[PDB]
Design a protein around this ligand. Sequence first.
Ligand SMILES: [Mg+2]
Ligand SMILES: [Mg+2]
Length: 109
Amino acid sequence: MLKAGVHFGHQTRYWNPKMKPFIFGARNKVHIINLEKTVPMFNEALAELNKIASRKGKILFVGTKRAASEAVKDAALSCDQFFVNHRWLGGMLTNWKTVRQSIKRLKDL
RNA sequence: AUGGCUGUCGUCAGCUCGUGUUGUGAAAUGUUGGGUUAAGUCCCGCAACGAGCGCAACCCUUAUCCUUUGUUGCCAGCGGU
Ligand SMILES: [Mg+2]
Ligand SMILES: [Mg+2]
């Protein structure tokens, strides 16, 4: 069942009321998530996620921070899988048709 | 009442657009920020991504050197004084 050795929870106060259902925490000012509920979402997650990787995988691994950027430009970068490892230029989906040519310049370059 | 022309802030760094986003809306963002430039100059940052007019460059001149050209210009090495 549990696979996350030391991923436990995180984040002291700064919590978000909406995150009670998945919190069982306490230990020292910072709450532990609900290890026993995290996983039941690897079900459904990787499921409906796989259920469209076969329907034809088009993903986009959004993840940024000089502390994980290329730990995402990884076997994630590789497969049926796109990504963004730095500042997410805003409107890049909603303005893909202005940005599409921001690509044409990348390649032409 | 005007065309054309001209002073002027000021060769100051400014003025805008599309698309995206935001607000009920006038509008906003972009162009609020951190540096730096002569500069909206540039670099980082950034719900914006991109662009046009201005900044800059392309023009004249000046400072070095090469090619060509030697009269009306030049005289280094020559012969004539
Ligand atoms: Mg400019
Ligand atoms: Mg100019």
